[PDB]
Amino acid sequence: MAADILVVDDEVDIRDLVAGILSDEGHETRTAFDADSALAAINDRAPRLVFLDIWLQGSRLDGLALLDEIKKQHPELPVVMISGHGNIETAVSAIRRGAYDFIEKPFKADRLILVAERALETSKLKREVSDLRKRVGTSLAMNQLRQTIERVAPTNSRIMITGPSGAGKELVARAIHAQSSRANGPFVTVNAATITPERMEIELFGTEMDGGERKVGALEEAHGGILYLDEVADMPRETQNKILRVLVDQQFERVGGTKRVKVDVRIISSTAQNLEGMIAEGTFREDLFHRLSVVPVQVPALAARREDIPSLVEFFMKQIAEQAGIKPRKIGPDAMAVLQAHSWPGNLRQLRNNVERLMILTRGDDPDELVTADLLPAEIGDQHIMALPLREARERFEKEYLIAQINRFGGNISRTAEFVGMERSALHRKLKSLGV
Amino acid sequence: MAADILVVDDEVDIRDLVAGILSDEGHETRTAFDADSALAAINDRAPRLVFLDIWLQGSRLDGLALLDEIKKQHPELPVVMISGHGNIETAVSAIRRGAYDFIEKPFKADRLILVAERALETSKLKREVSDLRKRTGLVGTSLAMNQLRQTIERVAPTNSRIMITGPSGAGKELVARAIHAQSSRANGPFVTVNAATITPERMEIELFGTEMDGGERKVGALEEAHGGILYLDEVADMPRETQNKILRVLVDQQFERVGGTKRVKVDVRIISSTAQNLEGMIAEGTFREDLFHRLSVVPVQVPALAARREDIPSLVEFFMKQIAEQAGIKPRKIGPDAMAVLQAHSWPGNLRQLRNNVERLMILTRGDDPDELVTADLLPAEIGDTLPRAPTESDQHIMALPLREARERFEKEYLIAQINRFGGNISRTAEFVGMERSALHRKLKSLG
Ligand SMILES: [Mg+2]
Ligand SMILES: [Mg+2]
């Protein structure tokens, strides 16, 4: 919103005009009148935005040449050109050479303010998404998978991605889109698992809300693009039917709508269920299944690609540090082999969760110290007492204490009795009363 | 980006010109000439972008009134206006009423393409941000969390330097950003430097910037922070040579870039954070006390998760939805049984640790009946074993005690842990544990 803006123009009245409007708005303004004075200002402190006279006469660099030098020094620094009456061609060329936009003399305030609000807003947006975009394996299976993606992507066929939960099907779907002919169209996702079965039709098909406002459903939003249906198996009965029509008709009704909307979508499905078995029990539709499954893509379980795990661990650490400010640590080779040999029912999500867990537990140890196999949980390699009121908690505790002591004495009740502080028959009676 | 662009203009020749230039470029175009045709096209299908004649002669609604209706229907659908020579005041007014930008007749292709491309890009980024935000993944009504909000408010209007102090994985960065948002620098930059994360080799460059080999310049954080606030996350991990330089910056309000000679002037308000007291930093030996005092003119304490256990259910519930979006896992009800464990734990790693454990639970119950409650036996050792619990051969010190002594130790530990769980509220603790209030007071004295 407020910014340190540098105004470079060879005319005293323009610098004064621009600087004054921008200051009046809340910005901080600096001025220059040629290449040297502009580059000296930039050197003093990089500004947030630059207004640059496109001609800039009586200067060592013309306006475009200066633009080039600015962009070389600060690639991400937005620059809006100030152009003359009917120098549209030259202005347009400035944009090819790196300028964001231009404003044409003469102008009053509102026009300039708006040009500047836009340049800053878009610049800000570019930086938020660039950061967020920060926040792929050697094995046979993953080479086959890459190979599969590349063959299947440039077709126009519906894809069904199959594999277990957590194996990273969404990533495969985005890969497909990136190499498809719809790569510059939209990529829209529907988490069929996640959305309430009630709201599912509104997410898919949209609707007119009470105010007159419209919710554009995912099909409509995906027009010209790809729709990725995640875990198609969690789709309701009436919703399956209605998607079947869409695949064939290429048309649908909005919830509560009468208009039949035409779209041109390419659908990618995924599932970790066995759908053929769901057909057999009448839970999912056969005809729907076959149309969604024309070309299949299989995503390998972590256990199918064990070779990849070290680099995956290494990768998730780089990323977890980004996401949480924790200096990444080295994993010790005994613990790494235990990671490498687990079955990973939750696959990549599960592996990430565990790596994140180790980094949290070892946050604030000597950085040269290794993550050891001691730290991994019981799954790798009924009721809690705290949920119980006093009488019941104490009874759980007596029971489990007695069982523990009994095992520690190898089943010898008389020895257990003596140690725990009871007469033998009384231990037997107590054990029975606690349900053993 | 190719896109579905509706073109709305009362002149056949303008629609033709626009739709044709846009088509040559690869877009899919549709056209209309008045409100009824424009709204029917939007009802047939929602376009990605609208060009709209600012005047729109021969129409039920003029261009401005049509802009109100389009925006009401589709608030995020960008609309670029087509205006005439000298219509700037009206164009400006269109922007106030929701238009993204305008183009002024006469125009040829290049100029029209640029306006389209920009409008599509900006609209794309607005969505791609909010989408990437959901795909990455201050809550609470506790006494402590109310205190923190009240403190943020009292402190934000100062000009003075803030030191935020609190345990790791508490949400200190968020506290920083809530302070920035209520300050007089809310419209300036907020810049973060995580001292722990940056290799100390690169710490000077990250902070103070440098001229790279190409001629390309790297703007350091301090310089980027000009006009705003710079957040020095975990200052303790800063090298002494960097400490010395920050001290000069605080008082000179100036600095040299790595390898540079210009003294860059800046106007930054520094907010700092750490997990340790002053006594701690002296004993560690790393960090200068004079600097510490100057970075901590106004203190803000971020309470540990154990000091606000009352918020654990809201945070559990909150993190489930976050995770449910970020990872495609259906959110599930945590059983009251498992919530009691979660709530009773002291969370040495605070919000990060809690979140990571909620993620864990949700991954481990991924292929279950949607009704079936999440249970405590899926929690790791560090959560379950630090609390009063059913013993096991593993626990040498319980196993060395006879039954009554073991039981009495357990009652004590249990009651203290439940008191803590309910944030010290005796009445509620008593209600849960099965006791009347005075009886609970009397039992506590009887056990020490
Ligand atoms: Mg000039
Ligand atoms: Mg017209």
PDB file of N, CA and C in Angstrom, chain A residues 2 28 43-46 72-73 101 111 118 122 129 133 174 193 211 214 220 223 254 259 261-262 323-325 353 356-357 379 383 386 388-390 394 398 401 405 407-408 419-420, chain B residues 28 43-46 72-73 104 114 118 122 128-129 135 187 197 214 217 223 226 257 262 265 324 330 337 341 352 356 359-360 363 382 390 393 399 401-403 407 411 414 418 433:
ATOM      1  N   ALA A   2       1.745   1.472   0.970  1.00  0.00           N
ATOM      2  CA  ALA A   2       2.669   2.637   0.899  1.00  0.00           C
ATOM      3  C   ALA A   2       4.060   2.211   0.466  1.00  0.00           C
ATOM      4  N   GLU A  28       6.394   7.626  -0.434  1.00  0.00           N
ATOM      5  CA  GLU A  28       7.605   8.362  -0.225  1.00  0.00           C
ATOM      6  C   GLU A  28       8.199   8.443  -1.593  1.00  0.00           C
ATOM      7  N   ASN A  43      21.258   2.930  -6.107  1.00  0.00           N
ATOM      8  CA  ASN A  43      22.354   2.556  -5.242  1.00  0.00           C
ATOM      9  C   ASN A  43      22.212   3.040  -3.774  1.00  0.00           C
ATOM     10  N   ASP A  44      21.701   4.258  -3.558  1.00  0.00           N
ATOM     11  CA  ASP A  44      21.459   4.818  -2.210  1.00  0.00           C
ATOM     12  C   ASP A  44      20.518   3.926  -1.401  1.00  0.00           C
ATOM     13  N   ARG A  45      19.421   3.536  -2.063  1.00  0.00           N
ATOM     14  CA  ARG A  45      18.480   2.565  -1.554  1.00  0.00           C
ATOM     15  C   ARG A  45      17.615   2.089  -2.725  1.00  0.00           C
ATOM     16  N   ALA A  46      17.565   0.785  -2.941  1.00  0.00           N
ATOM     17  CA  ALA A  46      16.605   0.209  -3.883  1.00  0.00           C
ATOM     18  C   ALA A  46      15.194   0.640  -3.508  1.00  0.00           C
ATOM     19  N   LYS A  72      18.448  -5.444 -15.088  1.00  0.00           N
ATOM     20  CA  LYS A  72      19.636  -6.244 -14.803  1.00  0.00           C
ATOM     21  C   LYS A  72      19.987  -6.230 -13.288  1.00  0.00           C
ATOM     22  N   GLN A  73      20.002  -5.038 -12.667  1.00  0.00           N
ATOM     23  CA  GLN A  73      20.317  -4.877 -11.225  1.00  0.00           C
ATOM     24  C   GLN A  73      19.239  -5.421 -10.275  1.00  0.00           C
ATOM     25  N   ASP A 101       4.036  -1.736 -17.172  1.00  0.00           N
ATOM     26  CA  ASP A 101       2.914  -1.005 -17.748  1.00  0.00           C
ATOM     27  C   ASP A 101       3.447   0.384 -18.118  1.00  0.00           C
ATOM     28  N   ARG A 111      -5.775   9.018 -12.471  1.00  0.00           N
ATOM     29  CA  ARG A 111      -5.213   8.080 -13.382  1.00  0.00           C
ATOM     30  C   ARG A 111      -3.868   7.571 -12.886  1.00  0.00           C
ATOM     31  N   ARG A 118      -2.062  -0.486  -8.912  1.00  0.00           N
ATOM     32  CA  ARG A 118      -2.007  -1.730  -9.677  1.00  0.00           C
ATOM     33  C   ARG A 118      -0.617  -2.285  -9.736  1.00  0.00           C
ATOM     34  N   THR A 122       0.087  -5.977  -7.978  1.00  0.00           N
ATOM     35  CA  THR A 122       0.552  -7.112  -8.749  1.00  0.00           C
ATOM     36  C   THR A 122       1.959  -7.536  -8.312  1.00  0.00           C
ATOM     37  N   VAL A 129       3.228 -15.337  -4.007  1.00  0.00           N
ATOM     38  CA  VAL A 129       3.117 -16.677  -4.648  1.00  0.00           C
ATOM     39  C   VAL A 129       4.450 -17.320  -4.951  1.00  0.00           C
ATOM     40  N   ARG A 133       5.197 -21.064  -3.557  1.00  0.00           N
ATOM     41  CA  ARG A 133       5.524 -22.170  -4.472  1.00  0.00           C
ATOM     42  C   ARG A 133       6.702 -23.080  -4.046  1.00  0.00           C
ATOM     43  N   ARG A 174      -1.151 -33.127 -11.471  1.00  0.00           N
ATOM     44  CA  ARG A 174      -0.599 -31.820 -11.856  1.00  0.00           C
ATOM     45  C   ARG A 174       0.500 -31.973 -12.894  1.00  0.00           C
ATOM     46  N   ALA A 193     -13.528 -37.060  -0.838  1.00  0.00           N
ATOM     47  CA  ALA A 193     -13.395 -37.392   0.570  1.00  0.00           C
ATOM     48  C   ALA A 193     -13.847 -36.180   1.419  1.00  0.00           C
ATOM     49  N   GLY A 211     -28.246 -13.792  -2.039  1.00  0.00           N
ATOM     50  CA  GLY A 211     -28.066 -12.380  -2.393  1.00  0.00           C
ATOM     51  C   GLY A 211     -28.178 -12.013  -3.870  1.00  0.00           C
ATOM     52  N   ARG A 214     -23.329 -15.567  -7.262  1.00  0.00           N
ATOM     53  CA  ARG A 214     -23.165 -16.894  -7.864  1.00  0.00           C
ATOM     54  C   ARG A 214     -21.871 -17.589  -7.372  1.00  0.00           C
ATOM     55  N   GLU A 220     -17.616 -25.852 -14.134  1.00  0.00           N
ATOM     56  CA  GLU A 220     -17.644 -24.532 -14.787  1.00  0.00           C
ATOM     57  C   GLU A 220     -16.320 -23.804 -14.699  1.00  0.00           C
ATOM     58  N   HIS A 223     -13.649 -25.323 -17.192  1.00  0.00           N
ATOM     59  CA  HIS A 223     -13.838 -25.139 -18.626  1.00  0.00           C
ATOM     60  C   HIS A 223     -12.548 -24.770 -19.314  1.00  0.00           C
ATOM     61  N   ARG A 254     -26.845 -26.302 -12.904  1.00  0.00           N
ATOM     62  CA  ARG A 254     -26.396 -25.775 -11.611  1.00  0.00           C
ATOM     63  C   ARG A 254     -27.441 -26.188 -10.565  1.00  0.00           C
ATOM     64  N   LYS A 259     -30.843 -23.567 -16.549  1.00  0.00           N
ATOM     65  CA  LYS A 259     -29.923 -23.505 -17.668  1.00  0.00           C
ATOM     66  C   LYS A 259     -29.006 -24.706 -17.708  1.00  0.00           C
ATOM     67  N   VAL A 261     -25.499 -25.843 -18.790  1.00  0.00           N
ATOM     68  CA  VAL A 261     -24.212 -25.177 -19.052  1.00  0.00           C
ATOM     69  C   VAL A 261     -23.260 -26.056 -19.844  1.00  0.00           C
ATOM     70  N   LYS A 262     -22.731 -25.563 -20.958  1.00  0.00           N
ATOM     71  CA  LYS A 262     -21.763 -26.331 -21.754  1.00  0.00           C
ATOM     72  C   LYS A 262     -20.364 -26.083 -21.282  1.00  0.00           C
ATOM     73  N   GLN A 323       9.148 -24.388   6.124  1.00  0.00           N
ATOM     74  CA  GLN A 323       7.832 -24.254   6.787  1.00  0.00           C
ATOM     75  C   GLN A 323       7.859 -23.927   8.306  1.00  0.00           C
ATOM     76  N   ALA A 324       8.973 -24.180   9.010  1.00  0.00           N
ATOM     77  CA  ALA A 324       9.018 -24.076  10.496  1.00  0.00           C
ATOM     78  C   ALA A 324      10.260 -23.450  11.153  1.00  0.00           C
ATOM     79  N   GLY A 325      11.249 -23.053  10.372  1.00  0.00           N
ATOM     80  CA  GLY A 325      12.460 -22.433  10.933  1.00  0.00           C
ATOM     81  C   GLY A 325      13.391 -23.338  11.738  1.00  0.00           C
ATOM     82  N   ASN A 353       5.191 -36.846   7.962  1.00  0.00           N
ATOM     83  CA  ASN A 353       4.736 -36.643   9.357  1.00  0.00           C
ATOM     84  C   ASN A 353       5.829 -37.098  10.368  1.00  0.00           C
ATOM     85  N   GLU A 356       8.926 -34.878  10.224  1.00  0.00           N
ATOM     86  CA  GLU A 356       8.614 -33.655  10.930  1.00  0.00           C
ATOM     87  C   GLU A 356       8.671 -33.957  12.419  1.00  0.00           C
ATOM     88  N   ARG A 357       8.082 -35.063  12.840  1.00  0.00           N
ATOM     89  CA  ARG A 357       8.108 -35.415  14.270  1.00  0.00           C
ATOM     90  C   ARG A 357       9.508 -35.462  14.857  1.00  0.00           C
ATOM     91  N   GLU A 379       4.937 -48.074  16.287  1.00  0.00           N
ATOM     92  CA  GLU A 379       4.465 -48.690  15.033  1.00  0.00           C
ATOM     93  C   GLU A 379       5.630 -48.991  14.074  1.00  0.00           C
ATOM     94  N   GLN A 383      -8.872 -47.534  26.456  1.00  0.00           N
ATOM     95  CA  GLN A 383      -9.093 -46.182  26.974  1.00  0.00           C
ATOM     96  C   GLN A 383      -7.883 -45.742  27.782  1.00  0.00           C
ATOM     97  N   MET A 386      -6.338 -41.104  31.798  1.00  0.00           N
ATOM     98  CA  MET A 386      -6.613 -39.693  31.918  1.00  0.00           C
ATOM     99  C   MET A 386      -8.008 -39.282  31.459  1.00  0.00           C
ATOM    100  N   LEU A 388     -10.602 -41.057  32.382  1.00  0.00           N
ATOM    101  CA  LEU A 388     -11.447 -41.682  33.412  1.00  0.00           C
ATOM    102  C   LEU A 388     -11.530 -40.867  34.707  1.00  0.00           C
ATOM    103  N   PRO A 389     -12.706 -40.862  35.369  1.00  0.00           N
ATOM    104  CA  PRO A 389     -12.837 -40.242  36.688  1.00  0.00           C
ATOM    105  C   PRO A 389     -12.017 -41.022  37.718  1.00  0.00           C
ATOM    106  N   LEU A 390     -11.885 -40.527  38.947  1.00  0.00           N
ATOM    107  CA  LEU A 390     -10.875 -41.068  39.891  1.00  0.00           C
ATOM    108  C   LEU A 390     -11.036 -42.565  40.207  1.00  0.00           C
ATOM    109  N   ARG A 394      -8.130 -45.228  39.084  1.00  0.00           N
ATOM    110  CA  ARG A 394      -7.446 -45.989  40.118  1.00  0.00           C
ATOM    111  C   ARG A 394      -7.625 -47.497  39.900  1.00  0.00           C
ATOM    112  N   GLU A 398      -4.620 -50.137  39.312  1.00  0.00           N
ATOM    113  CA  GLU A 398      -4.407 -51.353  40.121  1.00  0.00           C
ATOM    114  C   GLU A 398      -4.325 -52.623  39.229  1.00  0.00           C
ATOM    115  N   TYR A 401      -1.165 -52.572  37.032  1.00  0.00           N
ATOM    116  CA  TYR A 401      -0.004 -52.707  37.923  1.00  0.00           C
ATOM    117  C   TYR A 401       0.135 -54.169  38.338  1.00  0.00           C
ATOM    118  N   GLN A 405       3.250 -56.688  37.438  1.00  0.00           N
ATOM    119  CA  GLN A 405       3.983 -57.378  38.508  1.00  0.00           C
ATOM    120  C   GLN A 405       3.904 -58.889  38.335  1.00  0.00           C
ATOM    121  N   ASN A 407       3.553 -60.626  35.522  1.00  0.00           N
ATOM    122  CA  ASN A 407       4.479 -61.004  34.457  1.00  0.00           C
ATOM    123  C   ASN A 407       5.931 -60.921  34.937  1.00  0.00           C
ATOM    124  N   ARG A 408       6.321 -59.805  35.564  1.00  0.00           N
ATOM    125  CA  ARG A 408       7.669 -59.625  36.179  1.00  0.00           C
ATOM    126  C   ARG A 408       8.107 -60.743  37.108  1.00  0.00           C
ATOM    127  N   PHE A 419       5.348 -59.466  47.280  1.00  0.00           N
ATOM    128  CA  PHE A 419       5.997 -58.251  46.876  1.00  0.00           C
ATOM    129  C   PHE A 419       5.000 -57.099  46.869  1.00  0.00           C
ATOM    130  N   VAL A 420       3.850 -57.271  46.224  1.00  0.00           N
ATOM    131  CA  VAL A 420       2.902 -56.152  46.117  1.00  0.00           C
ATOM    132  C   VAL A 420       2.259 -55.768  47.452  1.00  0.00           C
TER     133      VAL A 420
ATOM    134  N   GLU B  28     -10.773 -17.795 -26.424  1.00  0.00           N
ATOM    135  CA  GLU B  28     -12.116 -18.133 -26.867  1.00  0.00           C
ATOM    136  C   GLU B  28     -12.991 -16.920 -26.574  1.00  0.00           C
ATOM    137  N   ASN B  43     -24.915 -16.184 -17.678  1.00  0.00           N
ATOM    138  CA  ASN B  43     -25.745 -17.341 -17.280  1.00  0.00           C
ATOM    139  C   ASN B  43     -25.462 -18.641 -18.100  1.00  0.00           C
ATOM    140  N   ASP B  44     -25.184 -18.528 -19.408  1.00  0.00           N
ATOM    141  CA  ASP B  44     -24.876 -19.727 -20.239  1.00  0.00           C
ATOM    142  C   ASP B  44     -23.628 -20.350 -19.635  1.00  0.00           C
ATOM    143  N   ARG B  45     -22.652 -19.504 -19.334  1.00  0.00           N
ATOM    144  CA  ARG B  45     -21.400 -19.920 -18.716  1.00  0.00           C
ATOM    145  C   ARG B  45     -20.664 -18.697 -18.170  1.00  0.00           C
ATOM    146  N   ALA B  46     -19.970 -18.846 -17.052  1.00  0.00           N
ATOM    147  CA  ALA B  46     -19.296 -17.727 -16.428  1.00  0.00           C
ATOM    148  C   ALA B  46     -18.011 -17.547 -17.169  1.00  0.00           C
ATOM    149  N   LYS B  72     -21.853  -7.930  -8.663  1.00  0.00           N
ATOM    150  CA  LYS B  72     -22.685  -8.530  -7.657  1.00  0.00           C
ATOM    151  C   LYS B  72     -22.706 -10.041  -7.898  1.00  0.00           C
ATOM    152  N   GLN B  73     -22.878 -10.461  -9.140  1.00  0.00           N
ATOM    153  CA  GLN B  73     -23.037 -11.874  -9.450  1.00  0.00           C
ATOM    154  C   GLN B  73     -21.753 -12.634  -9.297  1.00  0.00           C
ATOM    155  N   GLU B 104      -8.743   2.737 -23.706  1.00  0.00           N
ATOM    156  CA  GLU B 104      -9.341   3.931 -24.262  1.00  0.00           C
ATOM    157  C   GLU B 104      -9.219   3.842 -25.780  1.00  0.00           C
ATOM    158  N   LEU B 114      -1.918  -6.419 -24.204  1.00  0.00           N
ATOM    159  CA  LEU B 114      -1.269  -6.138 -22.935  1.00  0.00           C
ATOM    160  C   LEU B 114      -2.288  -5.963 -21.793  1.00  0.00           C
ATOM    161  N   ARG B 118      -2.395  -8.609 -18.651  1.00  0.00           N
ATOM    162  CA  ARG B 118      -2.245  -8.103 -17.294  1.00  0.00           C
ATOM    163  C   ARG B 118      -3.443  -8.458 -16.446  1.00  0.00           C
ATOM    164  N   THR B 122      -3.181 -10.965 -13.177  1.00  0.00           N
ATOM    165  CA  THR B 122      -3.414 -10.461 -11.840  1.00  0.00           C
ATOM    166  C   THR B 122      -4.515 -11.266 -11.169  1.00  0.00           C
ATOM    167  N   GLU B 128      -4.360 -18.044  -7.312  1.00  0.00           N
ATOM    168  CA  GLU B 128      -3.234 -18.916  -7.045  1.00  0.00           C
ATOM    169  C   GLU B 128      -2.623 -18.675  -5.672  1.00  0.00           C
ATOM    170  N   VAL B 129      -2.652 -17.447  -5.168  1.00  0.00           N
ATOM    171  CA  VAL B 129      -2.249 -17.177  -3.780  1.00  0.00           C
ATOM    172  C   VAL B 129      -3.140 -17.912  -2.805  1.00  0.00           C
ATOM    173  N   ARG B 135      -3.299 -24.836   0.363  1.00  0.00           N
ATOM    174  CA  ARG B 135      -2.467 -26.035   0.153  1.00  0.00           C
ATOM    175  C   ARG B 135      -1.174 -26.108   0.961  1.00  0.00           C
ATOM    176  N   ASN B 187       0.869  -0.592   6.590  1.00  0.00           N
ATOM    177  CA  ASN B 187       0.903  -0.513   5.136  1.00  0.00           C
ATOM    178  C   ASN B 187       2.311  -0.535   4.580  1.00  0.00           C
ATOM    179  N   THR B 197      17.751 -20.762  10.659  1.00  0.00           N
ATOM    180  CA  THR B 197      17.699 -21.387   9.330  1.00  0.00           C
ATOM    181  C   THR B 197      18.834 -20.972   8.410  1.00  0.00           C
ATOM    182  N   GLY B 214      27.321 -11.100 -11.590  1.00  0.00           N
ATOM    183  CA  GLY B 214      26.653 -10.564 -12.775  1.00  0.00           C
ATOM    184  C   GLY B 214      26.552  -9.040 -12.860  1.00  0.00           C
ATOM    185  N   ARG B 217      21.877  -7.241  -8.215  1.00  0.00           N
ATOM    186  CA  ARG B 217      21.947  -6.883  -6.804  1.00  0.00           C
ATOM    187  C   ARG B 217      20.938  -7.661  -5.950  1.00  0.00           C
ATOM    188  N   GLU B 223      17.254  -3.583   4.145  1.00  0.00           N
ATOM    189  CA  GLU B 223      16.922  -2.663   3.080  1.00  0.00           C
ATOM    190  C   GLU B 223      15.477  -2.905   2.580  1.00  0.00           C
ATOM    191  N   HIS B 226      12.709  -1.264   4.752  1.00  0.00           N
ATOM    192  CA  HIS B 226      12.529   0.197   4.739  1.00  0.00           C
ATOM    193  C   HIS B 226      11.079   0.668   4.713  1.00  0.00           C
ATOM    194  N   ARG B 257      26.449  -2.490   2.706  1.00  0.00           N
ATOM    195  CA  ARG B 257      26.176  -3.798   2.134  1.00  0.00           C
ATOM    196  C   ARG B 257      27.458  -4.590   2.193  1.00  0.00           C
ATOM    197  N   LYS B 262      28.753   2.423  -0.044  1.00  0.00           N
ATOM    198  CA  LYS B 262      27.611   3.264   0.259  1.00  0.00           C
ATOM    199  C   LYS B 262      27.012   2.899   1.618  1.00  0.00           C
ATOM    200  N   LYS B 265      20.674   4.407   4.048  1.00  0.00           N
ATOM    201  CA  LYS B 265      19.842   4.881   5.162  1.00  0.00           C
ATOM    202  C   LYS B 265      18.550   4.141   5.118  1.00  0.00           C
ATOM    203  N   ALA B 324      -7.155 -31.338   6.779  1.00  0.00           N
ATOM    204  CA  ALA B 324      -8.186 -31.924   5.923  1.00  0.00           C
ATOM    205  C   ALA B 324      -8.182 -31.285   4.546  1.00  0.00           C
ATOM    206  N   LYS B 330     -10.486 -36.852   5.128  1.00  0.00           N
ATOM    207  CA  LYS B 330     -11.767 -36.485   5.779  1.00  0.00           C
ATOM    208  C   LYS B 330     -11.576 -36.199   7.271  1.00  0.00           C
ATOM    209  N   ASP B 337     -12.267 -39.088  25.027  1.00  0.00           N
ATOM    210  CA  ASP B 337     -11.195 -39.812  25.688  1.00  0.00           C
ATOM    211  C   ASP B 337      -9.830 -39.348  25.205  1.00  0.00           C
ATOM    212  N   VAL B 341      -6.479 -36.726  26.885  1.00  0.00           N
ATOM    213  CA  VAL B 341      -5.040 -36.950  26.876  1.00  0.00           C
ATOM    214  C   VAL B 341      -4.358 -35.756  26.250  1.00  0.00           C
ATOM    215  N   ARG B 352       3.355 -26.375  17.020  1.00  0.00           N
ATOM    216  CA  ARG B 352       3.918 -27.298  15.995  1.00  0.00           C
ATOM    217  C   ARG B 352       3.759 -28.755  16.408  1.00  0.00           C
ATOM    218  N   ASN B 356       1.378 -31.599  14.593  1.00  0.00           N
ATOM    219  CA  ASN B 356       2.044 -32.738  14.000  1.00  0.00           C
ATOM    220  C   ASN B 356       1.387 -34.012  14.553  1.00  0.00           C
ATOM    221  N   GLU B 359      -2.023 -34.335  12.882  1.00  0.00           N
ATOM    222  CA  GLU B 359      -1.739 -34.947  11.559  1.00  0.00           C
ATOM    223  C   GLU B 359      -1.521 -36.452  11.677  1.00  0.00           C
ATOM    224  N   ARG B 360      -0.729 -36.854  12.656  1.00  0.00           N
ATOM    225  CA  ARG B 360      -0.442 -38.249  12.885  1.00  0.00           C
ATOM    226  C   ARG B 360      -1.737 -39.051  13.062  1.00  0.00           C
ATOM    227  N   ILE B 363      -3.698 -39.411   9.847  1.00  0.00           N
ATOM    228  CA  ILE B 363      -3.078 -40.392   8.937  1.00  0.00           C
ATOM    229  C   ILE B 363      -3.336 -41.846   9.382  1.00  0.00           C
ATOM    230  N   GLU B 382       6.152 -40.137  23.886  1.00  0.00           N
ATOM    231  CA  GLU B 382       6.339 -38.806  24.467  1.00  0.00           C
ATOM    232  C   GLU B 382       5.050 -38.089  24.889  1.00  0.00           C
ATOM    233  N   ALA B 390      -1.349 -46.299  33.269  1.00  0.00           N
ATOM    234  CA  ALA B 390      -1.173 -47.728  33.483  1.00  0.00           C
ATOM    235  C   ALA B 390       0.316 -48.073  33.377  1.00  0.00           C
ATOM    236  N   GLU B 393       6.127 -53.228  32.841  1.00  0.00           N
ATOM    237  CA  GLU B 393       7.434 -53.718  33.286  1.00  0.00           C
ATOM    238  C   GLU B 393       8.592 -52.714  33.031  1.00  0.00           C
ATOM    239  N   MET B 399       7.448 -50.213  39.487  1.00  0.00           N
ATOM    240  CA  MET B 399       7.565 -51.645  39.785  1.00  0.00           C
ATOM    241  C   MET B 399       8.320 -51.960  41.084  1.00  0.00           C
ATOM    242  N   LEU B 401       7.758 -50.196  43.838  1.00  0.00           N
ATOM    243  CA  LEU B 401       6.795 -49.880  44.904  1.00  0.00           C
ATOM    244  C   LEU B 401       5.722 -50.949  45.101  1.00  0.00           C
ATOM    245  N   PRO B 402       5.408 -51.299  46.366  1.00  0.00           N
ATOM    246  CA  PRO B 402       4.234 -52.161  46.573  1.00  0.00           C
ATOM    247  C   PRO B 402       2.915 -51.474  46.159  1.00  0.00           C
ATOM    248  N   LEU B 403       1.808 -52.187  46.265  1.00  0.00           N
ATOM    249  CA  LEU B 403       0.566 -51.752  45.661  1.00  0.00           C
ATOM    250  C   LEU B 403       0.045 -50.430  46.247  1.00  0.00           C
ATOM    251  N   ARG B 407      -0.319 -47.028  44.303  1.00  0.00           N
ATOM    252  CA  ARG B 407      -1.639 -46.460  44.113  1.00  0.00           C
ATOM    253  C   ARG B 407      -1.715 -45.015  44.604  1.00  0.00           C
ATOM    254  N   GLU B 411      -2.715 -41.729  42.512  1.00  0.00           N
ATOM    255  CA  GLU B 411      -3.759 -40.752  42.844  1.00  0.00           C
ATOM    256  C   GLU B 411      -3.225 -39.317  42.819  1.00  0.00           C
ATOM    257  N   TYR B 414      -2.270 -38.169  39.340  1.00  0.00           N
ATOM    258  CA  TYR B 414      -3.493 -38.058  38.570  1.00  0.00           C
ATOM    259  C   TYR B 414      -4.180 -36.755  38.879  1.00  0.00           C
ATOM    260  N   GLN B 418      -4.847 -33.606  36.358  1.00  0.00           N
ATOM    261  CA  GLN B 418      -6.205 -33.198  35.995  1.00  0.00           C
ATOM    262  C   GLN B 418      -6.465 -31.731  36.363  1.00  0.00           C
ATOM    263  N   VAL B 433     -13.294 -35.428  37.929  1.00  0.00           N
ATOM    264  CA  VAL B 433     -12.666 -36.553  38.621  1.00  0.00           C
ATOM    265  C   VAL B 433     -13.694 -37.347  39.443  1.00  0.00           C
TER     266      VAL B 433
END
